[PDB]
Amino acid sequence: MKRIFSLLEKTWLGAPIQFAWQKTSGNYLAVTGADYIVKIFDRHGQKRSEINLPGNCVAMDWDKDGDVLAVIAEKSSCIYLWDANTNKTSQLDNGMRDQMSFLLWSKVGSFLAVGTVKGNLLIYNHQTSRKIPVLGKHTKRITCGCWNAENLLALGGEDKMITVSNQEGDTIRQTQVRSEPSNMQFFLMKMDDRTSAAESMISVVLGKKTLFFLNLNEPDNPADLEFQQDFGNIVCYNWYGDGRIMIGFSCGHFVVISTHTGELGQEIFQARNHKDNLTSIAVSQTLNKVATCGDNCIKIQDLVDLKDMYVILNLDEENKGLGTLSWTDDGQLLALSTQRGSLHVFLTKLPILGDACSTRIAYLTSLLEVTVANPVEGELPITVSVDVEPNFVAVGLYHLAVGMNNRA
């Protein structure tokens, strides 16, 4: 693992940043701090675009293809939409009277959800330009939510309610919870019968202390998991494999639990990876690995055997107070924020891009360097510097091609 770049803007020093990777291609990284700007970087750390806001960024998210970034701000009714293929910004007025509090795209349809401080919801379809306002969805601030594989939307609010909806904003289900919902995620229970494929169940963190479960097929029997007070508060959690959750806790501990029928909440594994503080976990199902950050270090482990430490990185004393981790969906890059307002990006895996024509081969050797060789004829390897990170490479008798999205 090598550090590719670091962002240290003077305007961010002393305040926690927020950031988001582009969802399929991973070419762009959106970042914001206390300066009322969202800055869009390429994967080399060069600034490609900026979005000015009338107040703090409240939330940001990318569409299912990564073609569009959505942003919401304090004291604004406008959603800001930025397009990765044109580099342009546009504005979309929410049509409600209110300050926004939540933002999330579907993984399957071109649908964007927006929540408000008064508990109103808007769904926007980007392909049809259709707006769907839903007044009174919650009685207080919408705080969290998730989109299903079937384009169902689930939402939590400060009114201690959970609501489940279709893509047309209609309420399918409502439920009351013991404390404020946070970090909500949809999933599928793997029953022994192969015949069910829909994500029938929701997971959520209540009060930063308990993980709660709601089944849409059995809504009269929800489940609460409590954890040892010595672990501290739930900081984050992620889904893995067939029916597992990994949960990170503030006092340096993480836990893995089973969610299979008759073992729901059984602890499979536990570790104190960090002595004093754990601040984020990020799981890549693409690489089959997890990163954890705490005590000014990053620790990376195999999801097949969590005892096998892949990498430990220590970070210099300027970086005190780690923030959030997130990978690109190709599992090529890891980003880390700090509570002091810096961002750092690391190479987790070189892309295995290569091609052949007769005895001549081309292959990626660094993120911007393709090497061409002919190991049969004994020709010395030729190193080609390239202007972009390629998503594909091809070679001929006399030429090399590399390309990304719709360009070569």
Swiss-Prot record:
According to UniProt, the tissues expressing it are described as: Some isoforms are tissue-specific. Highly expressed in the prostate. Lower expression in the cerebellum, pituitary gland, fetal lung, and pancreas. In normal prostate, expressed in both basal and luminal epithelial cells. No expression detected in fibromuscular stromal cells, endothelial cells, or infiltrating lymphocytes. Uniformed expression in prostate adenocarcinoma cells.
Query: Positions of the WD repeats?
Result: 11-51, 52-92, 95-134, 137-175, 273-311, 317-356
Name any Gene Ontology BP term.
Answer: smoothened signaling pathway involved in dorsal/ventral neural tube patterning
Q: What induces it?
A: By androgenic hormones. Expression increased 3-fold in an androgen-stimulated androgen-sensitive prostate adenocarcinoma cell line compared with androgen-deprived cells.
Any one GO CC term of this protein is: ciliary tip
General function of this protein: As component of the IFT complex A (IFT-A), a complex required for retrograde ciliary transport and entry into cilia of G protein-coupled receptors (GPCRs), it is involved in cilia function and/or assembly. Essential for functional IFT-A assembly and ciliary entry of GPCRs. Associates with the BBSome complex to mediate ciliary transport.
Subunit: Component of the IFT complex A (IFT-A) complex. IFT-A complex is divided into a core subcomplex composed of IFT122:IFT140:WDR19 which is associated with TULP3 and a peripheral subcomplex composed of IFT43:WDR35:TTC21B. Interacts (via C-terminal region) with IFT122 (via C-terminal region). Interacts with BBS1. Interacts with TTC25.
Q: What is this protein called in UniProt? A: WD repeat-containing protein 19
Residue window of the full protein shown: 1 to 408 of 1342
